[PDB]
Design a binder for this molecule. Structure first.
Ligand SMILES: CC(C)CCC[C@@H](C)[C@H]1CC[C@H]2[C@@H]3CC=C4C[C@@H](O)CC[C@]4(C)[C@H]3CC[C@]12C
Ligand SMILES: CC(C)CCC[C@@H](C)[C@H]1CC[C@H]2[C@@H]3CC=C4C[C@@H](O)CC[C@]4(C)[C@H]3CC[C@]12C
Ligand SMILES: CC(C)CCC[C@@H](C)[C@H]1CC[C@H]2[C@@H]3CC=C4C[C@@H](O)CC[C@]4(C)[C@H]3CC[C@]12C
Ligand SMILES: CCn1c(=O)c2c(nc(/C=C/c3ccc(O)c(O)c3)n2C)n(CC)c1=O
Ligand SMILES: CCCCCCCC/C=C\CCCCCCCC(=O)OC[C@@H](O)CO
Ligand SMILES: CCCCCCCC/C=C\CCCCCCCC(=O)OC[C@H](O)CO
Ligand SMILES: CCCCCCCC/C=C\CCCCCCCC(=O)O
Ligand SMILES: CCCCCCCC/C=C\CCCCCCCC(=O)O
Ligand SMILES: CCCCCCCC/C=C\CCCCCCCC(=O)O
Ligand SMILES: CCCCCCCC/C=C\CCCCCCCC(=O)O
Ligand SMILES: CCCCCCCC/C=C\CCCCCCCC(=O)O
Ligand SMILES: CCCCCCCC/C=C\CCCCCCCC(=O)O
Ligand SMILES: CCCCCCCC/C=C\CCCCCCCC(=O)O
Ligand SMILES: CCCCCCCC/C=C\CCCCCCCC(=O)O
Ligand SMILES: CCCCCCCC/C=C\CCCCCCCC(=O)O
Ligand SMILES: CCCCCCCC/C=C\CCCCCCCC(=O)O
Ligand SMILES: CCCCCCCC/C=C\CCCCCCCC(=O)O
Ligand SMILES: CCCCCCCC/C=C\CCCCCCCC(=O)O
Ligand SMILES: CCCCCCCC/C=C\CCCCCCCC(=O)O
Ligand SMILES: CCCCCCCC/C=C\CCCCCCCC(=O)O
Ligand code: NA
Length: 389
């Protein structure tokens, strides 16, 4: 079978993926530049992620096509072509980790968020992560490689010049680097951390919603205790529990409804301590009207805000999960190649499928923003309509 036939299918699919990765991710960068509502710290890591996916199409995919032919080259030039995609993958992992951490600070410590994370600190984090991605991804160029033990029967068979090798990924890149150092330490470990962070995000959002409902019930229940009461101290008990639940839900038109709320509680408590119970019970049914006009409005707005952040955290978790789905097959195949020297090597068509799948990850993110983030979707339309004209 002419190898150029099967090679044509692999090359054609890769070029198709490159065009889509470039187009969709250029659109993401254009949206963030145009719409000032999208220019926040979270979306700067989105742009950093988009830039890495753009470079997959412009450089990594052409590099992959080149190395599939086994052309003769100087071994260290082959190493750079083979290892550059590892830089872009490491950059993606760092950007995903930052987005998870940024979303956790937003829900856990919302008050200091705007003081903690700033636009100028995010840019410096992004630059540091990119430098580290080059260091991790190009570590084979520092000596941990197979350039010292060339396959010379292959180089002679392909007619390579002196000092050249047949440029093949598994011939120059050691598999102990790929498995122990790249997969376990630099990919799997950061992915598990992301898993734990998102676990803390959804647990903390659940507890906050429950606390709000508990205070809402604590307020309403102790109101009925007052109505159907008989002694002055019972009135005092129910009221004091309301004052605590009133201050533990305060964490300007809201401050009014809370200024009134704590005020009416204070009036009714003074009546009970003096002993006038009937006057206290009646000074309480006014607390009702306060809740049906101010408190319930706050409880709804706070509840609607929390759900908006959970939605935004769910969207980021889908992006991280799709990364794992597209990259794990290739990594798992490397484990079989490395750990089972008695097993037959995975066939070539499966290698190409796992490689293509890892490249598909650079296409999917712009579809997630359009489906799940309304501000992205509207901005997308505006660009397409005003430039398809
Ligand atoms: C800024 C961007 C567009 C520049 C892209 C630079 C790329 C195309 C260059 C930089 C380093 C180059 C490599 C350096 C050394 C060798 C070894 C030689 O025996 C074959 C060519 C090969 C493998 C080169 C291929 C092209 C290469 C990868
Ligand atoms: C990450 C999710 C989608 C799971 C993916 C599992 C894939 C990558 C697994 C499941 C079955 C696996 C195959 C099972 C058996 C063999 C035969 C062996 O001689 C070479 C490896 C090879 C060919 C494995 C390659 C990896 C493989 C295809
Ligand atoms: C969260 C999950 C994805 C963690 C990753 C699981 C990986 C590290 C596990 C799952 C399946 C495992 C493989 C299953 C079977 C064998 C065959 C044996 O002869 C050598 C080890 C080898 C090849 C294992 C290597 C490690 C392996 C690839
Ligand atoms: C994520 C890193 N990474 C890899 O880990 C990888 C790989 N290409 C191979 C393997 C190729 C191959 C194997 C056996 C063959 O007979 C053959 O002809 C080709 N691997 C193991 N790419 C390059 C496209 C890659 O990006
Ligand atoms: C959490 C995920 C856990 C990952 C650890 C998996 C490690 C898997 C290691 C398997 C090693 C093995 O099978 O050695 C083969 C020897 O007998 C030589 O042939
Ligand atoms: C070879 C190096 C490859 C790429 C440069 C990476 C480009 C990534 C672009 C991210 C820039 C960004 O996120 O902007 C932040 C904003 O300016 C905060 O104020
Ligand atoms: C556009 C076409 C890209 C073709 C890339 C050249 C490599 C072909 C050699 C081969 O098939 O092994
Ligand atoms: C998701 C990907 C959808 C596209 C499916 C094809 C993906 C990669 C092609 C690899 C299989 C064909 C090339 C090798 C087969 C051969 O050598 O004859
Ligand atoms: C190849 C790499 C392609 C990168 C594509 C990303 C470009 C995105 C927008 C750049 C920012 C906008 C600068 C143009 C200013 C013109 C104007 O505002 O009128
Ligand atoms: C090379 C790849 C493209 C990098 C483009 C960076 C996008 C700039 C937009 C950032 C912003 O809008 O503030
Ligand atoms: C912009 C990036 C352009 C795409 C670069 C593609 C591969 C560069 C290396 C391929 C050239 C083969 C050199 C080996 C030789 O001719 O002897
Ligand atoms: C937007 C800029 C894109 C730059 C890349 C342009 C397209 C590159 C396509 C594939 C180049 C493959 C080169 C062939 C390798 C040498 C073949 C061989 O020696 O057998
Ligand atoms: C900037 C755009 C640069 C365009 C580079 C395009 C691909 C160059 C690929 C060189 C491979 C041809 C080698 C010639 C040969 O071996 O006979
Ligand atoms: C940019 C990469 C600088 C050097 C490329 C590899 C050197 C070599 O061909 O031996
Ligand atoms: C180490 C050599 C590689 C350095 C990579 C340069 C990346 C620089 C910052 C990206 C843009 C940050 C804003
Ligand atoms: C980062 C390390 C990059 C190393 C590139 C220099 C290669 C020198 C050479 O052997 O030709
Ligand atoms: C982390 C900070 C940046 C890490 C990189 C630091 C410098 C590495 C310089 C090593 C020189 C590479 C040449 C080795 C070679 O080509 O054989
Ligand atoms: C190997 C585990 C994969 C972790 C994916 C991280 C995203 C978590 C989403 C919920
Ligand atoms: C259909 C897409 C791929 C689905 C599952 C791949 C399972 C691979 C099992 C065949 C291994 C080939 C072999 O060992 O000879
Ligand atoms: C080569 C096919 C690429 C598939 C892209 C998947 C993105 C979502 C598609 C529906
Ligand atoms: Na990516």
């Amino acid at each position: 079978a002419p190898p150029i036939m099967g090679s044509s299918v692999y090359i054609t699919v890769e070029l198709a993926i490159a065009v889509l990765a470039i187009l969709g991710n250029v659109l993401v960068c254009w949206a963030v530049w145009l719409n000032s509502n999208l220019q926040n710290v979270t979306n700067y890591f989105v742009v950093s992620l988009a830039a890495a996916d753009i470079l997959v199409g412009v450089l990594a995919i052409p590099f992959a096509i080149t190395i599939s032919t086994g052309f003769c080259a100087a071994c260290h030039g082959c190493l750079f072509i083979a290892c550059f995609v590892l830089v872009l993958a490491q950059s993606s992992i760092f950007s995903l980790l930052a987005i998870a951490i940024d979303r956790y600070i937003a829900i856990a410590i919302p008050l200091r968020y705007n003081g903690l994370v700033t636009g100028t600190r995010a840019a410096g984090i992004i630059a540091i992560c990119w430098v580290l991605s080059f260091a991790i991804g190009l570590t084979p160029m520092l000596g941990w490689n197979n350039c010292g033990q060339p396959k010379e029967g292959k180089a002679h068979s392909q007619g390579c010049g002196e000092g050249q090798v047949a440029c093949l990924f598994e011939d120059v890149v050691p598999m102990n680097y790929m498995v122990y150092f790249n997969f376990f330490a630099c990919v799997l470990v950061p992915l598990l951390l992301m898993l734990g962070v998102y676990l803390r995000i959804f647990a903390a959002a659940r507890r906050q919603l429950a606390d709000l409902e508990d205070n809402w019930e604590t307020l309403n229940d102790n109101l009925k205790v007052i109505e159907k009461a008989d002694n002055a101290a019972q009135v005092k008990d129910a009221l004091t529990k309301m004052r605590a639940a009133a201050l533990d839900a305060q964490k300007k038109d809201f401050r009014h409804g809370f200024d009134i709320l704590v005020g009416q509680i204070d009036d009714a408590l003074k009546l009970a301590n003096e002993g006038k119970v009937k006057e206290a019970q009646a000074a309480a049914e006014q607390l009702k009207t306060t809740r049906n006009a101010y408190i319930q409005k706050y409880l709804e707005r706070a509840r609607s805000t929390l759900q908006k952040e959970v939605h935004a955290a769910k969207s980021a978790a889908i992006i991280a999960g799709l990364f794992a789905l597209c990259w794990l097959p290739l990594h798992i195949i490397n484990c079989f190649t490395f750990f089972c020297p008695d097993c037959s090597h995975a066939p070539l068509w499966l290698m190409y499928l796992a490689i293509v799948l890892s490249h598909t990850n650079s296409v999917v993110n712009p579809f997630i923003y359009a489906y799940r983030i309304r501000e992205f979707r509207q901005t997308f339309r505006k660009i397409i309509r005003s430039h398809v004209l």
